[PDB]
Amino acid sequence: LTPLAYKQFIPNVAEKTLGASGRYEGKITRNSERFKELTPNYNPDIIFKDEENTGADRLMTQRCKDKLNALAISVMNQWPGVKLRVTEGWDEDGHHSEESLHYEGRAVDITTSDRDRSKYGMLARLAVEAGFDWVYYESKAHIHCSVKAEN
Amino acid sequence: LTPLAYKQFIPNVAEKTLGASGRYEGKITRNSERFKELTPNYNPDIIFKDEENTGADRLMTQRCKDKLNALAISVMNQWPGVKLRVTEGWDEDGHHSEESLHYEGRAVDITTSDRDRSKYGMLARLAVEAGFDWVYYESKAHIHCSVKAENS
Ligand SMILES: O=C(O)[C@@H]1O[C@@H](O)[C@H](OS(=O)(=O)O)[C@@H](O)[C@@H]1O[C@H]1O[C@H](COS(=O)(=O)O)[C@@H](O[C@@H]2O[C@@H](C(=O)O)[C@@H](O[C@H]3O[C@H](COS(=O)(=O)O)[C@@H](O[C@@H]4O[C@@H](C(=O)O)[C@@H](O[C@H]5O[C@H](COS(=O)(=O)O)[C@@H](O)[C@H](O)[C@H]5NS(=O)(=O)O)[C@H](O)[C@H]4OS(=O)(=O)O)[C@H](O)[C@H]3NS(=O)(=O)O)[C@H](O)[C@H]2OS(=O)(=O)O)[C@H](O)[C@H]1NS(=O)(=O)O
Ligand SMILES: O=C(O)[C@@H]1O[C@@H](O[C@H]2[C@H](O)[C@@H](NS(=O)(=O)O)[C@@H](O[C@H]3[C@H](O)[C@@H](OS(=O)(=O)O)[C@H](O[C@H]4[C@H](O)[C@@H](NS(=O)(=O)O)[C@@H](O[C@H]5[C@H](O)[C@@H](OS(=O)(=O)O)[C@H](O[C@H]6[C@H](O)[C@@H](NS(=O)(=O)O)[C@@H](O)O[C@@H]6COS(=O)(=O)O)O[C@H]5C(=O)O)O[C@@H]4COS(=O)(=O)O)O[C@H]3C(=O)O)O[C@@H]2COS(=O)(=O)O)[C@H](OS(=O)(=O)O)[C@@H](O)[C@@H]1O
Ligand SMILES: [Ca+2]
Ligand SMILES: [Ca+2]
Ligand SMILES: [Ca+2]
Ligand SMILES: [Ca+2]
Ligand SMILES: [Cl-]
Ligand SMILES: [Zn+2]
Ligand SMILES: [Zn+2]
């Protein structure tokens, strides 16, 4: 398998296009009718940074959960002793671009647990193989991955 | 004001007596309908060990939450720079006595964040003052605290 380059995204189109993760449907807040669509991921093979100390990083859509949980497996197979790490999932702080899929539970920013930046190119590649609908090597510090809305 | 002795419990009766924390109603498992009765505690003035990496230690009943949150405050007042720490809350590992209130989200095992065992006698005392319905200096390593069911 081939790792992504810094700033490469796959598919090589904009995130909110139909070929990728598709339309942004609306921010989901904690008191919203739509908050019920998010379920917390408690997978022990995933590290959630949760620096917010709210659990918000664990919240994501069913489809995001499926792809993340598949990725958790391939990460452990790629690097014995290493785990998938999420630094941002659903966000209620407002610290992404206006209209970010994080506000809707459809995106994660990820690293490896050991925080070896040299692994992140390959991490992104595994995220693509796990079926994330858009994967972007957004930063030296993390990969951004998103999914399509629930059908 | 006065710390508990090693192996002292308060009130000085069995945990599952009325007068302490009262009857064990069934184990709550993660897929159970009764799991919705547990809510995760995200109090920033409490440290959750969460060695399971599941979040299970954060899960507890409303009453447990109220008492634990009161205790978090008195712990910081007692020892400047120190916090309440939980090592076990709700448990799905099966690591307690058969019929443990941990299986129902009604118990916590606690330490101080600095892990100074000499503080634990007083920690237990503060837990009593915070309103836990049974407090037991169960081990050199931790205090066990439980609460009554939401029905009473
Ligand atoms: O600077 C340049 O060279 C260039 O400057 C210009 O030419 C250009 O841009 S600019 O316009 O000039 O600015 C550009 O070409 C370039 O800048 C760009 O690249 C540089 C260099 O990066 S690289 O060489 O390309 O790889 C970037 O600078 C580097 O990254 C930044 C950054 O923030 O992204 C800085 O990194 C430091 O800060 C982050 C943020 O953390 S924090 O400050 O909020 O705390 C650190 O990550 C966080 O901390 C880590 C950590 O310490 O390991 C995690 O904490 C974990 O560990 C502790 C316990 O550890 S320990 O054992 O006690 O030691 C534990 O308690 C935590 O709980 C644990 N987390 S866990 O439990 O959840 O697992 C945190 O999770 C991290 O939080 S996070 O930030 O939200 O992800 C990072 O480690 C830290 N590095 S440092 O070495 O400690 O200083 C630095 O400035 C630099 O880092 S580097 O590694 O030395 O290279 C620059 O940002 C970039 N521009 S930009 O990206 O576009 O903005
Ligand atoms: O008669 C009977 O039937 C019974 O017999 C006796 O009971 C037995 C126990 O059953 C048995 N345990 S066992 O599982 O059956 O094997 C054992 O008790 C031991 C156990 O090891 C353990 O109990 S338990 O967890 O199974 O319930 C517990 O261990 C303590 C340590 O002793 C304590 N050390 S300390 O220095 O005095 O504070 C402390 O560990 C710390 C340490 O700092 C460090 O660990 S270590 O390597 O030194 O071992 C480590 O630090 C980490 C830290 O873990 C981590 N954070 S986190 O919170 O852990 O997540 C982070 O901060 O990093 C640091 C540093 O790491 S690093 O950076 O260098 O990489 O871990 C911490 C820590 O875990 O807290 O605490 C542990 C557990 O406490 S905890 O806080 O709630 O987690 O207790 C000991 C013990 O003291 O006994 O043996 C007893 C019998 O005793 S005996 O061995 O003397 O024979 C007992 O009878 S009796 O006769 O003894 O009275 C009764 O149970 C029954 O009678
Ligand atoms: Ca976060
Ligand atoms: Ca956030
Ligand atoms: Ca625990
Ligand atoms: Ca447990
Ligand atoms: Cl949980
Ligand atoms: Zn992102
Ligand atoms: Zn206990």
- Cα gap B90→B102, rounded to integer Å: 5
Written as six digits, the tokens of A126 are 């595994």
CB of B95 shorter than 6 A to ligand 2 = no
CA distance B106 to chain A (A): 21
Give the resolution value in Å: 2.4
CA distance B53 to chain A (A): 5
Helix (H) or strand (E) segment spanning residue B67: helix B62-78
B46 φ, ψ (degrees, to nearest 5)? -130, 140
Q: What is the residue with the minimal CA distance to atom 38 of ligand 1? A: A141
CB of B7 shorter than 6 A to ligand 2 = no
Residues from A in contact with B at Cβ < 8 Å? 40, 42, 44, 47, 53-55, 58
* Burial of residue B110, with CB atoms counted within 10 A of its CB: 0-12 exposed, 13-18 middle, 19 or more buried: buried
In the numeric block, the tokens 């030296």 are attached to A140
Q: Please state the domain count of chain B.
A: 1
If we measure between CA atoms, which residue out of B52, B135, B139 comes closest to residue B88? B52
Q: Which atom of ligand 1 is nearest to the CA of A140?
A: 26
Beta strands at B9-10 and A46-48: parallel, antiparallel or unpaired: unpaired
- Give Dmax over CA atoms of chain A in angstroms: 43
Residue-number span of the structural domain to which B40 is assigned: 1-152
DSSP secondary structure of A55-120: SGGGEE-HHHHHHHHHHHHHHHHHSTT--EEEEESS-SS--S-TT-GGGGT-EEEEEETT--GGGH
Q: Report which residue type is found at A140.
A: K
CATH number, domain containing residue B135:
3.30.1380.10
Q: A44-53: string of b/e by CB count within 10 Å (b at 16+)?
A: eebbbebeee
CB of B142 shorter than 6 A to ligand 2 = yes
- Cα gap A4→B93, rounded to integer Å: 40
- Cα gap B135→B11, rounded to integer Å: 7
What separation in Å is there between the alpha carbon of B83 and the centre of ligand 8?
33
